[PDB]
Homo-oligomer: A and B are copies of this chain.
Amino acid sequence: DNMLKMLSDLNKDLEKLLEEMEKISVQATWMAYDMVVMLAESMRRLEDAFLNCKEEMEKNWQELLTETK
C-alpha cells in the first residue's frame, strides 16, 4: 500500500535527526579531547557551550513532546 511510502518518509526523517545528533556527538567529543591534549579559559568556554547546547536541545525536545502529544 501507500504504507511503504509513509514508513519510508518517517524513516528518512528519524534518520536525519539521528544523524544530526551523531555528528554533534562526534564533533563535540573531539573538540574536548583535542583541547586537553593540545587553556583554563578555552575549557570554560567549551564546557559552557556544551551545557548551553544541552539545555537548548532539552527545550527543543519538550517542544516536540508538545507538538506530538
Binding site for B on A (CB under 8 A): 6-7, 9-11, 13-14, 16-18, 20-21, 23-25, 27-29, 31-32, 35-36, 39-40, 42-43, 45-54, 56-58, 60-61, 63-64, 67-69
A49 and B32 within 8 A (CB): no
B51 and A13 within 8 A (CB): yes
Which residues does chain B contribute within 8 Å of A29, judged by CB atoms?
14, 18
22 contacts between A and B (CB under 8 A): A6-B39, A6-B40, A7-B36, A9-B47, A10-B47, A13-B50, A16-B50, A17-B24, A17-B50, A17-B53, A17-B54, A18-B28, A21-B21, A21-B24, A27-B61, A31-B68, A45-B68, A48-B67, A52-B64, A53-B60, A57-B57, A57-B60
